Structure formats: C-alpha cells, structure tokens
Design a protein around this motif. Structure first.
Motif, PDB file in Angstrom:
ATOM      1  N   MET A   1       0.934  -0.961   0.244  1.00 42.68           N
ATOM      2  CA  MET A   1      -0.280   0.326   0.206  1.00 42.68           C
ATOM      3  C   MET A   1       1.054   1.158  -0.299  1.00 42.68           C
ATOM      4  O   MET A   1       0.266   2.226  -0.748  1.00 42.68           O
ATOM      5  CB  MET A   1      -0.462  -0.065   0.854  1.00 42.68           C
ATOM      6  CG  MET A   1      -1.646  -1.111   1.070  1.00 42.68           C
ATOM      7  SD  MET A   1      -2.434  -0.888   2.572  1.00 42.68           S
ATOM      8  CE  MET A   1      -3.685   0.442   2.401  1.00 42.68           C
TER       9      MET A   1
ATOM     10  N   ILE B   1       1.741   4.193  -3.195  1.00 42.89           N
ATOM     11  CA  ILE B   1       1.169   5.371  -3.068  1.00 42.89           C
ATOM     12  C   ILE B   1       2.369   6.104  -3.251  1.00 42.89           C
ATOM     13  O   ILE B   1       1.679   7.204  -3.721  1.00 42.89           O
ATOM     14  CB  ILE B   1       1.055   5.870  -1.276  1.00 42.89           C
ATOM     15  CG1 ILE B   1      -0.745   5.401  -1.035  1.00 42.89           C
ATOM     16  CG2 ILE B   1       1.305   6.841  -1.144  1.00 42.89           C
ATOM     17  CD1 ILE B   1      -1.641   5.675   0.315  1.00 42.89           C
TER      18      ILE B   1
ATOM     19  N   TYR C   1      -6.065  -2.363  -4.111  1.00 44.76           N
ATOM     20  CA  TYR C   1      -5.421  -1.855  -2.991  1.00 44.76           C
ATOM     21  C   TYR C   1      -4.432  -0.482  -4.540  1.00 44.76           C
ATOM     22  O   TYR C   1      -3.813   0.076  -4.118  1.00 44.76           O
ATOM     23  CB  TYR C   1      -3.995  -2.697  -2.706  1.00 44.76           C
ATOM     24  CG  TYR C   1      -4.670  -3.670  -1.345  1.00 44.76           C
ATOM     25  CD1 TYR C   1      -4.793  -2.777  -0.044  1.00 44.76           C
ATOM     26  CD2 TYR C   1      -5.231  -4.482  -1.431  1.00 44.76           C
ATOM     27  CE1 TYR C   1      -5.487  -3.744   0.565  1.00 44.76           C
ATOM     28  CE2 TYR C   1      -5.612  -5.280  -0.966  1.00 44.76           C
ATOM     29  CZ  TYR C   1      -5.972  -4.824   0.894  1.00 44.76           C
ATOM     30  OH  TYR C   1      -6.181  -5.862   1.483  1.00 44.76           O
TER      31      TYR C   1
ATOM     32  N   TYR D   1      -5.650   2.798  -4.361  1.00 51.08           N
ATOM     33  CA  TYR D   1      -4.529   4.275  -4.037  1.00 51.08           C
ATOM     34  C   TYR D   1      -3.302   5.025  -5.234  1.00 51.08           C
ATOM     35  O   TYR D   1      -2.558   5.436  -4.079  1.00 51.08           O
ATOM     36  CB  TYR D   1      -3.497   3.631  -2.845  1.00 51.08           C
ATOM     37  CG  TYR D   1      -4.625   2.757  -1.197  1.00 51.08           C
ATOM     38  CD1 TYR D   1      -4.730   4.168  -0.558  1.00 51.08           C
ATOM     39  CD2 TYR D   1      -5.705   1.714  -0.764  1.00 51.08           C
ATOM     40  CE1 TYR D   1      -6.018   4.050   0.492  1.00 51.08           C
ATOM     41  CE2 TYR D   1      -5.559   1.783   0.135  1.00 51.08           C
ATOM     42  CZ  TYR D   1      -6.060   2.968   0.684  1.00 51.08           C
ATOM     43  OH  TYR D   1      -7.051   2.522   2.156  1.00 51.08           O
TER      44      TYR D   1
ATOM     45  N   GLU E   1      -5.956   9.200  -1.361  1.00 51.15           N
ATOM     46  CA  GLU E   1      -5.157   8.911  -0.979  1.00 51.15           C
ATOM     47  C   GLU E   1      -5.728   8.239   0.579  1.00 51.15           C
ATOM     48  O   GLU E   1      -5.155   8.891   2.412  1.00 51.15           O
ATOM     49  CB  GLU E   1      -4.716  10.701  -0.079  1.00 51.15           C
ATOM     50  N   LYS E   2      -7.488   8.128   0.851  1.00 52.44           N
ATOM     51  CA  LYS E   2      -7.467   7.608   1.273  1.00 52.44           C
ATOM     52  C   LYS E   2      -8.736   7.045   1.182  1.00 52.44           C
ATOM     53  O   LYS E   2      -9.457   7.599   0.163  1.00 52.44           O
ATOM     54  CB  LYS E   2      -8.150   8.619   2.130  1.00 52.44           C
ATOM     55  CG  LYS E   2     -10.087   8.651   3.726  1.00 52.44           C
ATOM     56  CD  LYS E   2     -10.201  10.108   4.326  1.00 52.44           C
ATOM     57  CE  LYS E   2     -11.775   9.188   5.360  1.00 52.44           C
ATOM     58  NZ  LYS E   2     -11.939  10.303   6.001  1.00 52.44           N
ATOM     59  N   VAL E   3      -9.556   5.465   1.267  1.00 52.24           N
ATOM     60  CA  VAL E   3     -10.556   4.328   0.894  1.00 52.24           C
ATOM     61  C   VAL E   3     -11.365   4.441   1.731  1.00 52.24           C
ATOM     62  O   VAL E   3     -10.532   3.756   3.180  1.00 52.24           O
ATOM     63  CB  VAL E   3      -9.805   3.126   0.540  1.00 52.24           C
ATOM     64  CG1 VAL E   3     -11.219   3.090  -0.348  1.00 52.24           C
ATOM     65  CG2 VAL E   3      -9.250   4.070  -1.512  1.00 52.24           C
TER      66      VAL E   3
ATOM     67  N   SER F   1      -5.625   5.048   5.778  1.00 48.25           N
ATOM     68  CA  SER F   1      -4.845   6.292   5.112  1.00 48.25           C
ATOM     69  C   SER F   1      -3.912   5.713   4.860  1.00 48.25           C
ATOM     70  O   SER F   1      -2.585   6.528   4.210  1.00 48.25           O
ATOM     71  CB  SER F   1      -4.991   7.825   5.946  1.00 48.25           C
ATOM     72  OG  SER F   1      -6.591   8.205   5.527  1.00 48.25           O
ATOM     73  N   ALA F   2      -3.527   4.113   4.850  1.00 48.61           N
ATOM     74  CA  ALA F   2      -1.937   3.188   4.483  1.00 48.61           C
ATOM     75  C   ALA F   2      -1.618   3.398   5.569  1.00 48.61           C
ATOM     76  O   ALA F   2       0.080   3.308   5.324  1.00 48.61           O
ATOM     77  CB  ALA F   2      -1.679   3.556   2.934  1.00 48.61           C
TER      78      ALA F   2
ATOM     79  N   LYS G   1      -7.050  12.568  -4.756  1.00 49.09           N
ATOM     80  CA  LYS G   1      -5.488  12.524  -4.154  1.00 49.09           C
ATOM     81  C   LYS G   1      -6.418  14.468  -4.884  1.00 49.09           C
ATOM     82  O   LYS G   1      -7.009  14.222  -5.751  1.00 49.09           O
ATOM     83  CB  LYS G   1      -3.851  12.637  -4.974  1.00 49.09           C
ATOM     84  CG  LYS G   1      -3.934  11.078  -4.313  1.00 49.09           C
ATOM     85  CD  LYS G   1      -2.477  10.705  -4.849  1.00 49.09           C
ATOM     86  CE  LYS G   1      -2.615   9.707  -4.579  1.00 49.09           C
ATOM     87  NZ  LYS G   1      -0.857   8.576  -5.266  1.00 49.09           N
TER      88      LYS G   1
END
Length: 219
Positions: free
Chosen positions: A27, A31, A136, A139, A143-145, A162-163, A188
């Motif tokens: 993750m 990102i 995944y 991402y 920046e947030k799932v 948020s990883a 993002k």
C-alpha cells in the motif's frame, strides 16, 4: 427524574486493526510510485465489483430470498467534485463484519508478497489483477479509501484506512445500501481527472468492457 450513568459503553465504536506485513508494505509502494498508467484502478475496482455480483447470483439460484434486499445487479459510478470523492456502488453479495476485516486486512497477504516479488522480476502494476490484490491499486489515485458494506447475515459496517499501517472498522450509521459494497475513494488533489464525466467514460470503454453487469454513471 433520576441521574443516569453509563457504566459500560458496550462494543467499541471504532476498532483499529493492523494490516499484515506485506499488505501494508504494498500500500505504501502504490502510494509512493509515480506510475502514469494509474487508470487501472477503475478496471480493478469494477472487476472486483463484478466478482461480488457473481457470488450473489450464484447463491440466489438456489435461494431467491437472498435477493429480497436487492433485486437488480448493477454497478454505479458516482462522482462528486464537491467532496472530492468518486463513489463506486455495486449490489453484490457484500461482506460480513468478520469477512470485511479479514478480506481487506489479512488474506491479501498471499498475493501481495507474490506481486511485489513479481515487481522485483520486472512486472507491471497493470498486472495487479492477476494476484487478486487489485483493490489496493485504488491508492494509485486516492489518499484515503472508505468501504461501505452490507450483507444478508450481518449489519452495515464501514472500512477506513489511509495506509498508515492500520485500518478502522465501525458500524456505518448512514445511507443504507441494502446489500453489497460501496467503495468511496477520497481522490488525491492532483487526481480529480477521474472525477470528470468525459474521463470516466473512456476508461470504462477501454478496460472494463468485459463486464457482464450494467455500469451506470451518475454524473
């Protein structure tokens, strides 16, 4: 006319679990990499939604009562430039709270270690679907799932991460989806490209044209 005092609150309204080693390891890579072909996130998320629809169709052929909560099997794409979120709603089988935690938080470890080892052998991020860890890849542009989910044998819970190496699980008190998986992507700031009506249209037509379920765009 008396004095109340909550001795015990009950179950925690927010449970912070921790990803497996490999899972949180991937993750962070997803990102941080500067991968340009990052449109595959819409292919993988839709594909994963199609898998949830195949399941609810399978068990319904021996039990039509499992569709009492939702008759139609659809895939909805809901953009929202206001809150900078792109929502993906499928009326699949969904997940139970035990299944939600485990699926996204643990069993991904299998194909995750394999996908990263493949990247050490010159594999592409595009091939993330072959490992079942295609979720995944969301991402790449988020920046947030947040994942909303309802099952025919449990209540409605929410998945949020948020990883940071951890994710939270809480009972979702809000819009009832009836059944399935509602993936809310917090894009993002530089990825609002996939929030435009035109942009979403091509990706669906370029990649996920193999889907056997109606993809409706509420833009």
């Amino acid at each position: 006319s008396h004095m109340p005092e909550e001795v015990h609150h009950g179950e925690e309204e927010v449970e912070t679990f921790a990803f497996q080693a490999e899972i949180a390891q991937l993750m962070s890579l997803i990102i941080n990499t500067f991968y340009s072909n990052k449109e595959i996130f819409l292919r993988e998320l839709i594909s994963n939604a199609s898998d949830a629809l195949d399941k609810i169709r399978y068990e319904s052929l021996t039990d039509p009562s499992k569709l009492d909560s939702g008759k139609e099997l659809k895939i909805d794409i809901i953009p929202n430039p206001q809150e900078r979120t792109l929502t993906l709603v499928d009326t699949g089988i969904g997940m139970t709270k035990a299944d939600l935690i485990n699926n996204l938080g643990t069993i991904a470890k299998s194909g995750t270690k394999a996908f990263m080892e493949a990247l050490q052998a010159g594999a592409d991020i595009s091939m993330i679907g072959q490992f079942g860890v295609g979720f995944y890849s969301a991402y790449l542009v988020a920046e947030k799932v947040v994942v909303i989910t309802k099952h025919n044998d449990d209540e409605q819970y929410a998945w949020e991460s948020s990883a940071g190496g951890s994710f939270t699980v809480r009972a979702d008190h809000g819009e009832p989806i009836g059944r399935g998986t509602k993936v809310i992507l917090h894009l993002k700031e530089d990825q609002t490209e996939y929030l435009e009506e035109r942009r979403v249209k091509e990706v669906v037509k370029k990649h996920s044209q193999f889907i056997g379920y109606p993809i409706t765009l509420y833009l």
